[PDB]
Amino acid sequence: WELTILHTNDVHSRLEQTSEDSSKCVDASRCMGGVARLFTKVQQIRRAEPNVLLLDAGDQYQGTIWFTVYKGAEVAHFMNALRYDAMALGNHEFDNGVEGLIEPLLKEAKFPILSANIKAKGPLASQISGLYLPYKVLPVGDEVVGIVGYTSKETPFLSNPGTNLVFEDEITALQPEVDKLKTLNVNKIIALGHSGFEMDKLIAQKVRGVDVVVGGHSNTFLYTGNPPSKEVPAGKYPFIVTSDDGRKVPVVQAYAFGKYLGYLKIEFDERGNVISSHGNPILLDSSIPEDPSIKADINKWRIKLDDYSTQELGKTIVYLDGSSQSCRFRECNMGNLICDAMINNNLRHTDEMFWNHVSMCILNGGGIRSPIDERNDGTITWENLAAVLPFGGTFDLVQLKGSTLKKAFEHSVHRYGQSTGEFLQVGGIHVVYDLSRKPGDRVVKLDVLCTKCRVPSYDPLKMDEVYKVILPNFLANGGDGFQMIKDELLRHDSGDQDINVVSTYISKMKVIYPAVEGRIKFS
């Protein structure tokens, strides 16, 4: 018995077709993804295959002005229109709190929403009871397929789930629900969840009874053969994990931003064992046309969003590299732009006096969520900025010891090479790293633009000197494991809204040209 699993993860409010780097589509003839083009590929498959399951492994929430305005109503509407069969809750579905998930998404979704490891205590229990489930048993033809859900254990450290939601260990929560399914003679079990390629491999290995693991969160690109675009595969598709009980368990992911539709065809025997599986993510490129009905529906919704693009903030003569393969691995000019906006807006505050000379900046590269293209004649709109900075935080001012900053720089590359968001973009700092050294002893040079000097210049960081640094409030409060900043700072003040800072800066410069200058080097 064959089943075709179609799957998406980390769409991140990319309802419209986007450029190759998933930023605002300018050249419509070369644009990819979007729910309308996804509809066309799903329909084509459903026409040709009788046993199809369309599944989302989370993080449809957050990413573009679609989310800023509709707060999740666009997720329910366009997922309902695509006829999704099931969706696992991601960390980003709690970005607007529990009420921001319950009221627009859970109560309007037609498909089941799953998570077996989220438990609800207090008065939330009665309200959210049944609005999401640990599993769902689905009829597929004349057979039945069980889907168990999971959600990142780290969600309270990345989102706003509140204090009436406990996030259990994935494996501990999943095993009893998989066992319950097997006692109900549900022999075909998909584990659909949002925890990352690493936890997915672990779930395939340790959770007996699981046949397939469909995942997300790590934005993993898996491919068998020649990749169709710039994404480099982190392994074959499907990735095969040999479980402890000898079974071969396929693990799949479909990159992110609606760019690819994950496609896995599975051949099962009558006892629900996997004989074989094969597939590849389908690159949703311009060859596949956008479904006219979905496009005209997206366009009707798009009328409300057109007042953000209507206002041009400024112009850029350069590509604003806000990608994850640059901003989490090396110096990217988008981190440089954000830090120069942070420092400049603060310095124009002639009302204060304590932070009126701050010239140092640190910025978590994972906080930079999108690049910005320059082929619109340089034109930068609020809509573009909204995708680079969707968390709506502030730019806080902090007083740190040199040893505290040195520890933050060690932390910045302690587990380098995993697309980890803790890699820092700097301003008024020149750091050199030697990755061929033990984690914690990789900073080989660190110079900062001094302040106890009349004519600044980058001078060696002193371990016991005090520095005034501007950074996102997220870092100021210990986010990304930057607990040393929260534990060791000497003063912490709130600043202006991150998007209003960068927006005001660009309008004042009128033409920006951030570049890679040697702020971060490797030895």
Ligand X SMILES: COC(=O)c1ccc(CO/N=c2\ccn([C@@H]3O[C@H](COP(=O)(O)CP(=O)(O)O)[C@@H](O)[C@H]3O)c(=O)n2C)cc1
Residues forming a β-bridge with 9: none
Nearer to ligand X, 154 or 459 (CB): 154
271 annotated binding-site participant: no
411 annotated binding-site participant: no
| Cα pseudo-dihedral 151, 156, 157, 158, rounded to 10 | 60
Nearer to Zn ion, 213 or 506 (CB): 213
Interaction between residue 59 and Zn ion (CB under 5 A): yes
Angle among Cα 319, 321, 324 to the nearest 5 degrees reads: 155
Interaction between residue 91 and Zn ion (CB under 5 A): yes
Residue tagged 């094969």 (tokens)? 278
Nearer to ligand X, 66 or 474 (CB): 474
Nearest Cα to Cα of residue 58 among 22, 83, 94: 94
349 annotated binding-site participant: no
Rounded least distance, CB 187 to ligand X, Å? 32
Interaction between residue 498 and ligand X (CB under 6 A): no
Range list of β-strands (E), 243-308: 248-252, 260-268, 274-279, 282-283
C-alpha 282/C-alpha 232 separation (Å) is 15
Cis (ω within 30 of 0) for the bond into 456?
A: no
For the chain, the distance separating the N- and C-terminal CA atoms, rounded to the nearest angstrom, is 55
Stated as kind and residue range, the H or E segment containing 8 is strand 2-8
| Contact predicate 281/273, CB 8 Å | no
Give the count of residues interacting with ligand X (CB under 6 A).
23
- Enter the tokens of residue 412: 């910045």
| Contact predicate 128/113, CB 8 Å | no
10 annotated binding-site participant: yes
Task: List phi, psi (to 5°) of 319.
Answer: -75, 135
Nearer to Zn ion, 91 or 280 (CB): 91
Site residues for Zn ion, window 194-253 (CB under 5 A)? 217
Site residues for ligand X, window 151-190 (CB under 6 A)? 158-160
Rounded least distance, CB 257 to Zn ion, Å? 9
Interaction between residue 428 and ligand X (CB under 6 A): no
Rounded least distance, CB 75 to ligand X, Å? 13
Interaction between residue 62 and ligand X (CB under 6 A): yes
Nearer to Zn ion, 231 or 331 (CB): 231
Which residue has the closest beta carbon to ligand X? 366
**Residue 382: Cβ-neighbour burial (10 angstroms; 0-12, 13-18, 19+):** middle
C-alpha 119/C-alpha 332 separation (Å) is 40
Q: Which does 231 bind (CB under 5 to 8 A by kind): ligand X, Zn ion, none?
A: none
Site residues for ligand X, window 372-411 (CB under 6 A)? 390-393
Give the β-pairing of 466-472 and 360-364. parallel
Rounded least distance, CB 9 to Zn ion, Å? 7
Rounded least distance, CB 203 to Zn ion, Å? 16
Contacts of 8 (CB under 8 A, 6+ apart): 38, 55, 56, 57, 254, 258, 261, 262
> DSSP code of 103?
I
Interaction between residue 328 and Zn ion (CB under 5 A): no
C-alpha 504/C-alpha 261 separation (Å) is 38
Site residues for ligand X, window 190-229 (CB under 6 A)? 217, 219
Nearer to ligand X, 418 or 451 (CB): 418
Nearer to ligand X, 146 or 196 (CB): 196
12 annotated binding-site participant: yes
Rounded least distance, CB 366 to Zn ion, Å? 10
Interaction between residue 95 and ligand X (CB under 6 A): yes
Binding footprint of ligand X on the chain (CB under 6 A): 10, 59, 62, 91-92, 95, 158-160, 217, 219, 364, 366-367, 390-393, 421-422, 474, 479-480
Binding positions for AMP are 328, 364, 369, 391, 474, 480
Binding positions for Zn(2+) are 10, 12, 59, 91, 194, 217
Binding footprint of Zn ion on the chain (CB under 5 A): 10, 59, 90-91, 217
